[PDB]
A paper describes a structure:
Lipid flippases actively transport lipids from the exoplasmic leaflet to the cytosolic leaflet of cellular membranes thereby creating and maintaining an asymmetric lipid distribution between the two leaflets. Most eukaryotic lipid flippases belong to the P4-ATPases subfamily of the P-type ATPase superfamily (with the sole known exception of ABCA4). The P-type ATPases share a common architecture with three cytosolic domains that are involved in the autocatalyzed ATP hydrolysis: the nucleotide-binding (N) domain binds ATP, the phosphorylation (P) domain contains a conserved aspartate residue, which is phosphorylated during the transport cycle, and the actuator (A) domain contains a conserved glutamate, which is responsible for the subsequent dephosphorylation of the phosphoenzyme intermediate, that enables the protein to return to its initial state5. Here, we present a total of nine cryo-electron microscopy structures of the human flippase ATP8B1-CDC50A complex at 2.4 to 3.1 Å overall resolution, along with functional and computational studies, addressing the autophosphorylation steps from ATP, substrate recognition and occlusion, as well as a phosphoinositide binding site.
The ΔCter-ATP8B1 construct was incubated with nucleotides (ADP or the non-hydrolyzable ATP analog adenine-(βγ-methylene)-triphosphate (AMPPCP)) and/or AlFx to stabilize forms similar to E1-ATP, E1P-ADP and E1P conformations, corresponding to autophosphorylation from ATP and subsequent ADP release events. The cryo-EM structure of the ATP8B1-CDC50A complex in the presence of AMPPCP mimics an ATP-bound E1 state and reveals the ATP binding pocket of ATP8B1. As expected, AMPPCP is bound similarly to other P-type ATPases. The adenosine base is stacked by a π-π-interaction with F596. Additionally, D554 is directly engaged in the coordination network of the ß-phosphate, mediated by R652. Indeed, the R652 rotamer state is constrained by interactions with D554 and D734. Noteworthy, the D554N mutation has been identified in patients suffering from PFIC129. Interestingly, extra density was also observed at an interacting distance to the ß-phosphate of AMPPCP, suggesting the presence of an additional cation or a water molecule (see Supplementary Discussion). However, closer inspection of all E1 states along with the outward-open E2P states (autoinhibited and active conformations, see further below) reveals the presence of a density at the canonical, phosphorylation-coupled transport site of P-type ATPases between TM4, TM5 and TM6. Due to the geometry of the site with no more than four ligands, we modeled the site as a water molecule.
Residue numbers in the entry:
A (entry chain B): 24 to 351
B (entry chain A): 106 to 174, 328 to 481, 493 to 773, 795 to 812, 836 to 1183
The structure:
């Protein structure tokens, strides 16, 4: 019929190969070695996370007796809460200020998609032609909404500030800087203003503000590098969270010039303009101050998980060892 | 052309049409939860790769035209059932979450002012709309590349049969061929083997040994070189002096007639140009018999339409040929009518004694001891062809000859009109004697018949040769040993009648074809007859399959395919038919796996088969190496293919709870595209082609490993839901370990991977590594390309993903590519890598522990010999 088949390693099923078999002397060391690797990492992360100092102030006022419950029914648009908290142990180094939102589904399909990417990327064509994707907020009355979409529309628009109550009882404001609170790529690549011109007023011609926003996107900040689509607060909002209960970076408190702690232990008051309504869907607002750590942030779950898995792997090795010993 | 290509790819295959129906679902925007990219690109590649496996054939056919001018596997049936099971599970889960979204929307969705879209859709409608949303996000449960991967697995495995060098016969220079590239796993599931005897269990390299005429047996040592005869050759080794001088001198009419018949009743074409009077016989019996006849001076020189050129001891006497009664498996005997120059019409005949003795003359004193002679030759595995002759009166021949010529009336009449002439003349026959010819078992057949029996393959042999020769050949090839209590049809017949009327180690069933029909007998009355037919037919198979061996004798081609059908219908056992010669093609088509020996009878019953190697000896490697590996390589492929796909989509089902059941994809939109084709497609294919539980030499030495496939222990309908339970858990771990790690702080600073984009990068990353590490656990043959594909899959993902999330690609598609700066930011943070390591360790270590316990507590035979390297 045909000639002799060629004699090559692949064709004759004779490729050189290692035949690993899960011998009792091979699975056991990896199980115990994992026990001696996860545990020290698990205790390492746990104690490192437990060292982090954090304070979470829930200032939504849903519960009665909180002395700004009036803001749940804001007859006057400007409402204010003054929540006092005292820190037992002073914060050291950079202190990060976040705002938290709970039971707030930022990962809804109708929500995450509702946005125009070319518009935020600084596309002139898409500036006056919002995509169909941000359908419910394409245009307000006659001309398109510049930050279209259900995401840019429902933006966290509270005004959080911190005061230090010293012995004199006079509130001393503590510096909060709004710059450098977004990913480098988001500021420098993903989000951009429309091209052309120098004044932001002339760039956004034929575009209104979103319906919920009180003021246009032109002057979200006085800094020319922080006004428009490249605004730090706005960018931090559009970065959709993965779960309902999230918290987003708001302000930074960098190291003080003096050797004293950045936030010395003492009486502080949180002066916040209650603008965001969340009590309709049982949403909770929180203000979170956290201190920087070299090994990420405060993640007690991983430390407990590594210890939990580290112990299971060590136990599994012993259990597997016993079974091998009996059935040897 | 190509337009027909996709036309039958879609309709014929349910999965291929399922995804086309999905594009329509993804086209409409009111329910499109995934982009159209997510289905075309995995579809075009699957529809593109399969085109290459068939288009290359057509273009070759087109070139051929210019130059010149069904069997479905058992798993193939299961695979269809799995895919129809995934549809139901997908429809139930999609309907289950559709309920959950309507109730979520009614309570939380309607009260949520941020999720306002301006479309007053009632919560019952919003749930309905997202029922199609979860037919799209969770669509990938149905494996798109299952139907293309299996073709590559089977094609590659089949091509190992062609390239095999141990399955290659040198002197005849014909390697093994696998002419069906879809029956590979079924070679490892064979329960029965039906084999021809002559040409399959014997070489059909024949030589004349003995003889008997008028009761006097010749060919023994009593009272040599044939130099006295010019036509003779030394190839024939004969030691019988008495017949040599008797035929040389003092010749008698008996020996003259007997040898003359062998050189007249033949049908062998002859050549004389070489000067040695070469012969080329289509039937080994005829060629050897004439080759033996010429050795004694009865040499056949030439033949034409009206005469012959036979020679007798140098006396070249030319006869006249009038009619030749053709031979077939039904007739079982050949005859020729020849007119001598004297003017007498002499009819010669030969064939099986069974059909010739019934037509003998009343006066035949040599009939009795000739039967004893015939039995004597069969005792040494010698095929016997009885002879006979008769004379036809001139007066009665005229009308018969005219009728014989009139029988050639064209049309289909010649099928039986000739036969009517055949039986109307063959009334009285004068016995002459019987021949004795030697056939020898192929090399390593007794090794194979013993080897395959160790794998619990019941070897049935279906042979048209005599009762005695088959029984002794069965003993010769170790098919029947000294422990066998043979029984015949009468023993079977009595048992069946006894039970039928009442209700109204090694054993054999050596039974003749005549007794095969007798037991089976081959408005209300018709129904009862059909009921009787099924009752006895079912009783026979249950009586036959209960014994290790079976010998079927005097069986025509109709009775070969019949028996194969009986086992198939009434036992549900996979069958293999191996044979040579046109008589076996009826059974090669009936059997699940059809094997064809090239043999000496003809190159005919191999093109009508599935595998066409040269010798029965090679059946050791087809089943115990290629068939056995092909089964485990296919099952290991399926046990992982469902896992890697059913553990991929289920994150969408778990993430549905923390997003309002809104059908939000936990993965990147462009990661769903490449996962099925790019990230987790190469390593599984390389497994199904290059995996070996034990070495080839060590799989022959332990045929018991074959049993894993006969009983179907490696991929049941039960092990489908253990790979799904594996898929559910892996998706549960892949989701809830990242979720637990992000509910709390995760590297939260100016560069914080806590958003959703870093949630898709973490789950997808730990998913790619987990499956590509769990395939590494599956492969038992870590060749230097299995490692490359496994690590290539993981390294490829981190290469493309960086490119996709790189700032440069953002220019090409600001909208379609919207993940920029996530991969280069979500994996430089240690907590993300501490979550991926934990998500992989806690997802793979339980598999290692589960696998190790199974080895230690319930070791399999494959593992038992793998532990002992020697
Ligand atoms: C801060 O954000 C909140 C919500 O994110 C803003 O409340 C929203 O205010 C808009 C009006 O600017 C409301 O839209 C419509 O207002 C008209 C009156 O012009 C009213 O008749 C409609 O019924 C409708 O409410 C919107 O409803 C309201 N949000 C909610 C949940 O009711 C708020 O104005 C923002 N404040 C600043 C200073 O940016
Ligand atoms: N040309 C031929 N002339 C006379 N008899 C023949 C013959 N070919 C076969 N026979 C005889 O017919 C009987 C059956 O022959 P058949 O044509 O059915 O195939 P077979 O049985 O020889 C193949 P196998 O041996 O593998 O079963 C045998 O007994 C044989 O002796
Ligand atoms: C919070 O601090 C303010 C200002 O010091 C004070 O007027 C108010 O009474 C304090 N409230 C409580 C509950 O201590
Ligand atoms: C809080 O901030 C507002 C706005 O700057 C200011 O008017 C007020 O005096 C501050 N202190 C309060 C409300 O106690
Ligand atoms: Mg045969």
């Amino acid at each position: 019929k045909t000639r002799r088949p060629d004699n090559t390693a692949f064709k004759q099923q004779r490729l050189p190969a290692w035949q690993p078999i899960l011998t009792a002397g091979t699975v056991l060391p990896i199980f115990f070695i994992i026990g001696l690797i996860f545990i020290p990492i698990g205790i390492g992360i746990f104690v490192t996370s437990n060292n982090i100092r954090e304070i979470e102030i829930d200032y939504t006022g849903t519960e009665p007796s909180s002395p700004c419950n009036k803001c749940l029914s804001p007859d006057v648009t400007p409402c204010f809460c003054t929540i006092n908290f005292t820190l037992e142990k002073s914060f050291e180094g950079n202190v990060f200020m976040y705002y938290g939102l709970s039971n707030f589904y930022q990962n809804h399909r109708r929500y995450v998609k509702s946005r125009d990417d070319s518009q935020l990327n600084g596309d002139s064509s898409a500036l006056l032609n919002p995509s169909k994707e941000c359908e419910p907020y394409r245009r307000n009355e006659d001309k398109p909404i510049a930050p279209c979409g259900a995401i840019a529309n429902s933006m966290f628009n509270d005004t959080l500030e911190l005061f230090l109550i010293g012995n004199d009882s006079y509130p001393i404001p503590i510096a909060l800087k709004k710059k450098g609170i977004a990913w480098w790529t988001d500021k420098n690549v993903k989000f951009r203003n429309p091209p052309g011109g120098d004044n932001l007023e002339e760039r956004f011609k034929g575009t209104t503000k979103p319906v919920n926003w009180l003021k246009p996107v032109y002057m979200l900040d006085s800094d020319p590098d922080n006004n428009g689509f490249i605004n730090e607060d706005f960018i931090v909002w559009m970065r959709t969270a993965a779960l309902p209960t999230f918290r987003k970076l708001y302000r930074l408190i960098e190291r003080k010039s003096d050797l004293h702690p950045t936030l010395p232990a003492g009486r502080y008051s949180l002066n916040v303009t209650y603008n965001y309504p969340v009590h309709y869907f049982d949403g909770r607002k929180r203000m979170i101050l956290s201190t920087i750590s070299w090994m990420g942030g405060k993640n007690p779950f991983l430390g407990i998980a590594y210890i939990a898995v580290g112990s299971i792997s060590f136990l599994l090795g012993v259990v597997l060892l016993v079974i091998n010993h009996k059935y040897r | 052309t190509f337009i027909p290509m996709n036309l039958f790819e879609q309709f014929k295959r349910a999965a291929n049409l399922y995804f086309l129906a999905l594009l329509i679902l993804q086209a409409v925007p009111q329910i499109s939860t995934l982009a159209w990219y997510t289905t075309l690109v995995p579809l075009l590649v699957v529809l593109g790769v399969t085109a290459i496996k068939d288009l290359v054939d057509d273009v070759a056919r087109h070139k051929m035209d210019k130059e010149i001018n069904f069997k479905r596997t058992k798993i193939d049936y299961l695979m269809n059932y799995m895919v129809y099971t995934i549809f139901v599970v997908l429809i139930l889960l999609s309907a289950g979450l559709a309920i959950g979204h309507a109730y979520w929307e009614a309570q939380v969705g309607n009260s949520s002012w941020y999720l306002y879209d301006g479309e007053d859709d009632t919560p019952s409608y919003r749930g309905f709309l997202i029922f199609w949303g979860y037919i799209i996000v969770l669509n990938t449960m149905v494996p798109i590349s299952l139907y293309v991967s299996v073709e590559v697995i089977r094609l590659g495995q089949s091509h190992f049969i062609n390239w095999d060098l141990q399955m290659y016969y040198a002197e005849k220079d014909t390697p093994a061929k696998a002419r069906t590239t879809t029956l590979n796993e079924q070679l490892g599931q064979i329960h029965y083997i039906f084999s021809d005897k002559t040409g399959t269990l014997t070489q059909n390299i024949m030589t004349f040994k003995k003889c008997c005429i008028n009761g006097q047996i010749y060919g023994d040592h009593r009272d040599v070189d044939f130099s006295w005869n010019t036509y003779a050759d030394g190839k024939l080794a004969f030691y019988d002096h008495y017949l040599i001088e008797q035929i040389q001198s003092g010749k008698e009419p008996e020996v003259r007639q007997f040898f003359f018949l062998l050189a007249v009743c033949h049908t062998v074409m002859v050549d004389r140009t070489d000067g040695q009077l070469n012969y080329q016989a289509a039937s080994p019996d005829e060629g050897a018999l004439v080759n033996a006849a010429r050795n004694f001076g009865f040499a056949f020189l030439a033949r034409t339409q009206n005469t012959i050129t036979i020679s007798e001891l140098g006396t070249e006497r030319t006869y006249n040929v009038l009619a030749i009664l053709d031979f077939n498996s039904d007739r079982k005997r050949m005859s020729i009518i020849v007119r001598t120059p004297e003017g007498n019409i002499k009819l010669y005949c030969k064939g099986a004694d069974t059909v010739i003795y019934e037509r003998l003359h009343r006066m035949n004193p040599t009939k009795q001891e000739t039967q004893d002679a015939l039995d004597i030759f069969a005792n040494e595995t010698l095929r016997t062809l009885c002879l006979c002759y008769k004379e036809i009166e001139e007066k009665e021949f005229t009308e018969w000859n005219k009728k014989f010529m009139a029988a050639s009336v064209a049309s289909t009449n010649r099928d039986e009109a000739l036969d009517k002439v055949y039986e109307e003349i063959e009334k009285d026959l004068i016995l002459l004697g019987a021949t004795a010819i030697e056939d020898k078992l192929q090399d390593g057949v007794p090794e194979t018949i013993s080897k395959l029996a160790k794998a619990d393959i019941k070897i049935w042999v279906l042979t048209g040769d005599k009762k005695e020769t088959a029984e002794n050949i069965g003993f010769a090839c170790e098919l029947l040993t000294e422990d066998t209590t043979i029984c015949y049809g009468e023993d079977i017949n009595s048992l069946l009648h006894a039970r039928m009327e009442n209700q109204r180690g090694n054993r054999a069933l050596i039974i003749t074809g005549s007794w095969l029909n007798e037991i089976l007998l081959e408005t209300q009355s018709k129904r009862r007859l059909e009921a009787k037919k099924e009752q006895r037919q079912k009783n026979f198979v249950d009586l036959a399959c209960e014994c290790s061996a079976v010998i079927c004798c005097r069986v025509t081609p109709k009775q070969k395919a019949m028996v194969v059908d009986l086992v198939k219908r009434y036992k549900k056992a996979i069958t293999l038919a191996i044979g040579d010669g046109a008589n076996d093609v009826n059974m090669i088509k009936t059997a699940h796996i059809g094997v064809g020996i090239s043999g000496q009878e003809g190159m005919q019953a191999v093109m009508s088969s599935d595998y066409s190697f040269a010798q029965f000896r090679y059946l050791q490697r087809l089943l115990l190496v290629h068939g056995r590996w092909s089964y485990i390589r296919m099952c290991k492929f399926l046990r992982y293919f469902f896992y890697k796909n059913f553990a991929f989509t289920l994150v969408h089902f778990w993430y549905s709870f923390f997003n309002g059941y809104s059908a939000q994809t936990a993965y990147e939109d462009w990661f769903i595209t490449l996962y099925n084709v790019l990230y987790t497609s190469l390593p599984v294919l390389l497994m199904g082609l290059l995996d070996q539980d034990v070495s080839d030499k060590l799989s022959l030495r332990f045929p018991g490993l074959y049993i894993v496939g006969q009983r179907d222990l490696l991929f049941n309908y039960k092990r489908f839901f253990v790979s799904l339970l594996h898929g559910v858990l892996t998706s549960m771990i892949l989701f809830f370990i990242p979720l637990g790690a992000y509910l709390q702080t995760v590297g939260q600073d100016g560069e914080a991977p806590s958003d959703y984009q870093s949630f898709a990068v973490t789950i997808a990353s730990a998913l790619v590594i987990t499956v590509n590490f769990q395939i590494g656990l599956d492969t038992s043959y870590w060749t230097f390309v299995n490692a490359f594909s496994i690590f290539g899959s993981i390294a490829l993902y981190f290469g493309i993903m960086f490119d996709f999330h790189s700032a440069g690609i953002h220019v090409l598609f600001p909208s379609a590519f919207q993940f920029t700066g996530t991969a280069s930011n979500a994996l430089r943070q240690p907590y993300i890598w501490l979550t991926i390591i934990l998500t992989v360790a806690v997802c793979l270590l339980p598999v290692v522990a589960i696998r190790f316990l199974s080895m230690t507590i319930w070791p399999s035979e494959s593992d038992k010999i793998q532990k002992h390297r020697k």
